[PDB]
């Protein structure tokens, strides 16, 4: 129940990776589609391409997958100055040894130490029983390959029955005592406008 005016949302982005599918990036204001979902995280610089609809990848099959017939797209940019520290900030971390290919758009939160099966390691963290994640470093200076990039994934539904966001915009001026077409609130016609 609001309008998402992306004319300012794409903003003065230094580089907005608006690689979008299913719709032209400019023709969304006139669309009146259903509800939208918001979620975001941060990924190391090189594999920003590695996340995409339905291709292989360690980050893709273990932490976040994207459906093939996906409506929507993502935005990514650089936040090296705000995130990285001189000593290196160690707060960001991703799963390492998931024994499955997680389906797109499902919740998966867990902290138990991974076991390679076979023998019951039983929470000892010995052989074949490894603690996953292996958090990043985010060194104060490095190339674009392992540079912190802030990315947001955007997904909106369809079927148009629960009209949720939409947007009217495009408000023009007014004239009087002249023949002119009027579209005040959806109704259309031709005539002259005066007082009453």
């Amino acid at each position, epitope marked *: 129940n609001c309008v998402a005016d992306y004319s300012v949302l794409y903003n003065l982005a230094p580089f907005f990776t608006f690689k979008c599918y299913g719709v032209s990036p400019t023709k969304l204001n006139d669309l009146c589609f259903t509800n939208v979902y918001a979620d975001s995280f941060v990924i190391r610089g090189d594999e920003v391409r590695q996340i995409a609809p339905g291709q292989t990848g360690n980050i893709a099959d273990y932490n976040y997958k994207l459906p093939d017939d996906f409506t929507g797209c993502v935005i990514a940019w650089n936040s090296n100055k705000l995130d990285s*520290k001189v*000593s*290196g*900030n*160690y*707060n960001y*971390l991703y799963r390492l040894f998931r024994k499955s290919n997680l389906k797109p758009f499902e919740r998966d*939160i*867990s*902290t*138990e*130490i991974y076991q390679a099966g076979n023998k019951p390691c039983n929470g*000892v*963290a*010995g052989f074949n029983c490894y*603690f996953p*994640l*292996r*958090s990043y470093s985010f060194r104060p200076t490095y190339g674009v390959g392992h540079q912190p990039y802030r990315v947001v994934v955007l997904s909106f539904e369809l079927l148009h029955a629960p009209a949720t966001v939409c947007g009217p915009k495009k408000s023009t001026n007014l004239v009087k005592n002249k023949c002119v077409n009027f579209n005040f609130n959806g109704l259309k016609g031709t005539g002259v406008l005066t007082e009453s």
Partner: antibody
Amino acid sequence: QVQLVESGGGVVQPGRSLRLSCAASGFTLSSYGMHWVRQAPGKGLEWVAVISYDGSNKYYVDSVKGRFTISRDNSKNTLYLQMNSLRAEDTAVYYCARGWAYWELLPDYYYGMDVWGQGTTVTVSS
Amino acid sequence: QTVVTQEPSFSVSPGGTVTLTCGLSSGSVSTAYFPSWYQQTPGQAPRTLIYGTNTRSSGVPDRFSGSILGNKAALTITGAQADDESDYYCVLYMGRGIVVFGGGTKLTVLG
């Protein structure tokens, strides 16, 4: 100012029950995680029990399973710990600790405890 | 069960450089386990010194610095003064509620 008041400590016969009381001033306990850590003379600190900011999950150490219960009161900004089946090894000084918050989104296995009150000592004697 | 190994006590002259070590005997220590360094003065409550493996608490002097050394958590202590001698603790985090502290180390100003 942020301060934690620990009351209810004392010396209790083994096998009885007591409710440790903790009052928070300056903030609301509903916004932060809370920790209970005990320390005995001649020993190091020993983790006992914690409560999350939301209270959806509760965790205890193996030595205290099935005997103690932790409860929180958001209305009066007061914290309670239930002690049952006390034994002589429980003679220690407990510190009520305040952890990080949902106000700063952190990953799972939440990082705990930065500031806490003076605490209160408890002894189990016959 | 996991046990954190710590050295009992050090003795270092004032103004010198010393480091404290905290590791795991059951495996390696990663930054995911979130090393933290806390100091306890007997008869009082501890103070928060080092968290985030590289960050100091509010009001903690920059003279204290910590990091990771191989599989052992390391804290760098340079320029010893009289008040730094006290008990010190290292904090490691396991999955979902298991946190294990070390054996405690009593730092001294040597003589």
